[PDB]
Symmetry: D3
Subunit: 302 residues, 6 copies
Amino acid sequence: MFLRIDRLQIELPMPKEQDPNAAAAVQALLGGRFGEMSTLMNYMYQSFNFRGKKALKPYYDLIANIATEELGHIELVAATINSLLAKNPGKDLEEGVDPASTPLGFAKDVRNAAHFIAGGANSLVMGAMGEHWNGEYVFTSGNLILDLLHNFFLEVAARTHKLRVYEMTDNPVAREMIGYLLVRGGVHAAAYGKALESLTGVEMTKMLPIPKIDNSKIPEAKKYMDLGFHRNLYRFSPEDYRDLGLIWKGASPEDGTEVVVVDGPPTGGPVFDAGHDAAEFAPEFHPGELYEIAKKLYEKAK
Amino acid sequence: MFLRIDRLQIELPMPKEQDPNAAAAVQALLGGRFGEMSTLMNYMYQSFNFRGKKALKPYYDLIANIATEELGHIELVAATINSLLAKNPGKDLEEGVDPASTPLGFAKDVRNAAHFIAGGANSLVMGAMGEHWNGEYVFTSGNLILDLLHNFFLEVAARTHKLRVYEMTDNPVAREMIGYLLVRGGVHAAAYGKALESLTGVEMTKMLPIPKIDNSKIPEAKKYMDLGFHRNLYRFSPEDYRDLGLIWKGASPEDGTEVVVVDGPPTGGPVFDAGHDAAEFAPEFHPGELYEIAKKLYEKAK
Amino acid sequence: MFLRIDRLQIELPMPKEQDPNAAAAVQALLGGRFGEMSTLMNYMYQSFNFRGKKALKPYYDLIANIATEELGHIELVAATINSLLAKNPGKDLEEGVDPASTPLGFAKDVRNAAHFIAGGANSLVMGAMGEHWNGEYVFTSGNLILDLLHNFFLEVAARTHKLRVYEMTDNPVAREMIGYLLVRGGVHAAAYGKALESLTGVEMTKMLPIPKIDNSKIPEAKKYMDLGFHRNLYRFSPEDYRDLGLIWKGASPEDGTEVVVVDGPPTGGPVFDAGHDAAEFAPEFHPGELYEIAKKLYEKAK
Amino acid sequence: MFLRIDRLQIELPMPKEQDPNAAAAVQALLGGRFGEMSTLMNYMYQSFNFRGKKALKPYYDLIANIATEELGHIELVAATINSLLAKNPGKDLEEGVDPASTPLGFAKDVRNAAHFIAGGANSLVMGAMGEHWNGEYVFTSGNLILDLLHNFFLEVAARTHKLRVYEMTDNPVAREMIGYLLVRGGVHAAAYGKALESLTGVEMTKMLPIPKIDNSKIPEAKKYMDLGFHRNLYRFSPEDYRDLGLIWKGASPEDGTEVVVVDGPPTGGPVFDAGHDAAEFAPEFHPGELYEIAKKLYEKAK
Amino acid sequence: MFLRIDRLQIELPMPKEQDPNAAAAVQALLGGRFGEMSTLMNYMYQSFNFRGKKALKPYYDLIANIATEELGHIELVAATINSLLAKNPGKDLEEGVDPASTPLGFAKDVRNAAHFIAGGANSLVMGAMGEHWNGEYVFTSGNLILDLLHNFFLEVAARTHKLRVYEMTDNPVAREMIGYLLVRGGVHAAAYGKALESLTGVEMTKMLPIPKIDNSKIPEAKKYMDLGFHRNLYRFSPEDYRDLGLIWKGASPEDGTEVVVVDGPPTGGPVFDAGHDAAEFAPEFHPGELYEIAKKLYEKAK
Amino acid sequence: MFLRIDRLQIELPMPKEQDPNAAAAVQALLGGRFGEMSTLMNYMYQSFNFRGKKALKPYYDLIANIATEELGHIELVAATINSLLAKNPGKDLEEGVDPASTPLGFAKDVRNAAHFIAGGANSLVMGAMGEHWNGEYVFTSGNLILDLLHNFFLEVAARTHKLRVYEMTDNPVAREMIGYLLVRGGVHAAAYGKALESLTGVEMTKMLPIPKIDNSKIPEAKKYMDLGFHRNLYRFSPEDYRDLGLIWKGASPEDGTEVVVVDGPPTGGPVFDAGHDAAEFAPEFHPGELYEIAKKLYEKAK
Ligand SMILES: [Cl-]
Ligand SMILES: [Cl-]
Ligand SMILES: [Cl-]
Ligand SMILES: [Cl-]
Ligand SMILES: [Cl-]
Ligand SMILES: [Cl-]
Ligand SMILES: [Cl-]
Ligand SMILES: [Cl-]
Ligand SMILES: [Cl-]
Ligand SMILES: [Cl-]
Ligand SMILES: [Cl-]
Ligand SMILES: [Cl-]
Ligand SMILES: [Li+]
Ligand SMILES: [Li+]
Ligand SMILES: [Li+]
Ligand SMILES: [Mn+2]
Ligand SMILES: [Mn+2]
Ligand SMILES: [Mn+2]
Ligand SMILES: [Mn+2]
Ligand SMILES: [Mn+2]
Ligand SMILES: [Mn+2]
Ligand SMILES: [Mn+2]
Ligand SMILES: [Mn+2]
Ligand SMILES: [Mn+2]
Ligand SMILES: [Mn+2]
Ligand SMILES: [Mn+2]
Ligand SMILES: [Mn+2]
């Protein structure tokens, strides 16, 4: 079972301008083959399907726990896309929009028109070409070593996509998210590499980084390394998965320093609200009446 | 962000033997169009994309919280499938399997061979025809009423699929899971119906049940209603989503009794471990050496 | 624009009992690559997209009119599938079905479980592997000769699929439908071949039949030829497409006899009603109340 | 069976300029998830699959008839796209096009290159991202109420997409089509809502409009309401489906006035011909010789 | 079995500038429905599946051999795309690229972002809309005449796409490849047409060209015809498939001159190397260390 | 460019009778995600897209050459499937088949009906669920180490699928093919592992085998190892790719013995001809006339 905390994993900056094509590129990191939906669903299904949940417990704890972290990463990437698509971020009401004035005219010419037609200027479950995420992006073979080898690869392929998208947009909201997730993905790659070394004797972490560029060269990633976050494997569970430190120990690939398990999630930051976009009818064309209904739900004695 | 608890939402019984074609049918309820992946991802993305998270908070709390519950439902359905596919449930080591003796010969003739080739006799992210789940199964328009109308439909369409699969499968593991999720889906349909009543004045809950068959006609569902589970909307969060009772109040469609918000998740039941399947090389062909590696990790613990 | 007549293009017989796997095979002829959806949508879109609707009118009339005929062919193939899937054909109310008794147990083991889960034991928009029909099965290039060459091929490929499914299914409903549509597909291939002869001088009809087997070897098709149906190109329009005989003239490939344009549709046969299937909740679990509602609508008629 | 009338459902204006990206957006309304292909094929297959064609006749008449109207809507949307893609609308011959001069250079940079490569600058069976329409967009459950609930949703989701595309392009051909189809979709939503109220007692039409914006705010829709077309359910059949008025009666959601059944289709307007586009080889590179062949087919004595 | 020669089928010119959208259009010719992947895989699988490899040997030789030629065409089209995507063609090392400087900023706005995210600025197995090539683009019916009819169509549909893409870009690398492959596709269409005439008596080559525009009107195609290459069917085999001349004989459709079989491949040209693209991390971010490792592999005594 | 040799990489035995479901399982090894189409197309596109073809030549030679070997593997797997689907292997003419007698009745009930409808009882470009192979199964990042890591994984994932299908199918044709390709896949995994060791210092070959089962436990694979085939990397080229031994050297993972580069392809075995299947109209319904046409082509030879 799962619980939810109404917080993003980190604070994101306020966007300052809508940037559709940046949002379309960032979609690769959400619903593309190596996006966060893929790391999430790979680890989630491997955790469901895991044989030897007690006999191979440290490895089960690892996959079950990292799957849980990736839930917050789909959330964070979706918030980033929503930030880039928001017309009036954080504002409950805009007035004066007339459909006949062609208020979505710009959207005719952007790469991803679906953001504005199917979505209400919001994230979709798709990649940078509009391709919807598909369950064949999941590998769940039942063989622990084969799955871990796949997962090591998956994290460094995902990192490669994050780096390339970083190089496509200088939007600060996108770069903040990417910097943080480069650091988290470095932790995951390192953790799967340590798990493989424990099972096989092959020193997989010595292959890192892939590609051969250090996170310290990406300013927004270095920001988070400077706070120590490359050392931390957070245990996203009240009472379970307590044996992570049997694998998550020893040296960090980033700097050689000792890594640690942190019990519980990080503090986080607030969730994002894109505000009213009347041309998208989101959350309604003129939402004042609905806001009044919600207000009155609280005004009650019962 | 999210947290994980290593418990299924209910306990499941143990099948007498593998039932591949039952597993293949139950896949519809996991990765098909109206499976638990779809309800999960619809509500998850709607919750990310929600505009007016404070101004429309009671409705945000509802979608965000039900999304969290559906995480445990993909888990529960996967456990059911895994139970039906497990050769040696709960048994860590089998001996004597010879690949040269065609130990997977039965799988040549089952509906879903992928369970045994791509999977290690485990669940996959697909429906009852082998169709992989796809992101176009998600509807996230940004318009609250349109989304809620969709979600009401989604729950009763999902219910219809659960009922039909129930009528195909006599296996207790499937009947228990389905009976439970018929009751939970009744709660979700009722909740979305109450939300639509509040926003629109249209008495959506009066349309229930769809199809026009009572959950009381399904023995396992009747048991869960006798335990009160049709009344309960669990708050799957440490501290958030405390306004569910503004919508989740009044009469149950099942029996007219007053519905309730329950603080926290249910206690549930143990997770499922399919054990060793040597022919599937899952978790390894001969896993004793890996079990020894894991044991030694604890000896070297700090 | 289009009009509808509540008649199948031929009458169909009644199966003795349900035959799921026959239905699954016949799906190839509905939603597969060379099924009736494909011939329909190819000619429909070509007719929309046709350039030179007046200057090339005889050819426009041909494509526009054959497209209309193919609408009735998707209808006829769907009726055949529905006939094979119907538990109680023609019977409005069945009693005593208990969902708890696994009344759909047989469906666990059939090829196409979707017929019974997604469908209410009814046709779906898919082929013989469960693959849903897709718009990339349409070829609409705008070049008349290229399109007609494609359409000649499409008809003989579709014929080949019909012949192979005929050889799989002994059910009279399927044999009657297929025999009829072998004759109609012979007309369409001949018509496109005559159109290509007129435009190019290449004697395309001399290539027929493809494969090199005569429709006379298929008993149901032989009967329809004995009724003259290989000669007939029906004008499926009140007043339009009156120049079909400019192309549809001269010898039939089947027997050398003169072909004819028939004003209007054939008289055909009754549409099919699969009746009540309570386990499928179709049209309702217990439909008597809805039947009463419908009866009362007539009492309140103006 | 079906008949065809060689007329669009309404007169469309002459385009005045090619607008590829407008055509790409309008594709959402043709082959996207909530485009006219989807409403068409949903109602068509539900009509084939309908159980109780006599016992539930008014409801059968409704679905069978609206399916037939949607055939003319795929035609109308395709004509709109073709208008936007036409280089020389209504002109049989253009001269002087040289392939080596890069006459399709603009198409390199438009969103939808397929319009110009796969199509001969014509409509395709796809949405606004190039996604081809797929049969999984059809819902045909066999349960009347569940299908009608789906269809109500489908019409208002389709309306939402039409409104958003309207707001993306000010092209008069697109806006004329959209205005008309907003009015027709309002009729369909109202009709399915009335059918649901008759079966369930739930006042579904009181939820309209969705989104909460009136068609009267869209000038091209108000044009058609001012002619009375929101009141009219046309019976697209010579002799069948005569019981529509048992459901289609009472108040219009638009203005409270009494709705009516109209026997037969509206008058319509001419079909559209995009003319010669030599660079697309459509209908031929230099079509004069083919036009002469067609002319000579008429010059005959026989 | 197969052998490889490290040469393109022709010399291509050096690109001079990156042209992403030209590369995206040329993708239609690689991984689209009528691209070189399709002609390749159609003929390859037909050759595997061929019945009567001795009894119908000349026809087997034809399909087996043309399949082999198409391997070099996927190679040639991929080289063309890679040329259009190359930043530093032929250069092993570039220095001074900083990811934080947004070196891929242009790629945010191009049609095909996947070239830069999934690919390292390189070709992908997809068409001009980003659609990945799929095995349903292959037709392998087992019936020789039906397959040959399909293949005739396939070549002229492929030619039509090549012509349209030619008209979209004036890039010399693209136009050189297209000119050559127009000539080769003319040979293939002619060869399948001759095979059909031999089997059926229908003069299929008299339909050529389709569309009705001569290759001699395309300067880069005329270049290769002026060298005689429209006459040549190369036998891509050391010792097999020696009976091609039983079919490949008689007049060329281009000019009426006698065609010939050439034993062995043409001379070819060098392969293409896109060079270092540091922002794509291709072949590495800073490849000097890897180049030194490779150099040292040669410095050996053993 | 490529050349073709009309030989399979090994000889195959003849099945006693058709085995449709065995063929359907073996399809996973052809067109599934980890089938031979995937290894082929991964290495083919990586070889096209390779940057530093001279500076990193030993690695280019390896990928380019292994790609060529995989061409013969799609051929070999297709031959295996065709063998399992052949009614009359090696027999040019069968008499007496009557389509009216349901000669394909068995095919109604097999897993893969497409083999008999779309195919003429022959292989298709799909996996074990009927899923067509797709280009998103290719990973071509441009980064050498990332690609090689992927390829190492791909080979062991493909091996895992081969092992599982082996365990499903007792047919000698399948066991021989799979035993051989287990040995060849061991060579490829070892080669990519050696390449990674050279570039990274990580001892990837020490992870082998994956899964942890020796090829010696599979009797057919053991025979091929006893013949030395695990040592051999064949140079599938007349004159190119002469630096394979710079990487392909040192110890075999199977037995510690020195590996070798073999100049040229193996001698292999005959290609397979499925013979006449009249019910499939393959190569024709009654092929005697076409056989006579072919005979006469030789009489008219030059
Ligand atoms: Cl990740
Ligand atoms: Cl991560
Ligand atoms: Cl649900
Ligand atoms: Cl639920
Ligand atoms: Cl047809
Ligand atoms: Cl037909
Ligand atoms: Cl509609
Ligand atoms: Cl409408
Ligand atoms: Cl080609
Ligand atoms: Cl070619
Ligand atoms: Cl392989
Ligand atoms: Cl291999
Ligand atoms: Li069982
Ligand atoms: Li039967
Ligand atoms: Li057998
Ligand atoms: Mn992540
Ligand atoms: Mn990760
Ligand atoms: Mn659920
Ligand atoms: Mn639910
Ligand atoms: Mn037809
Ligand atoms: Mn037809
Ligand atoms: Mn419509
Ligand atoms: Mn409608
Ligand atoms: Mn080619
Ligand atoms: Mn070709
Ligand atoms: Mn291989
Ligand atoms: Mn391999």
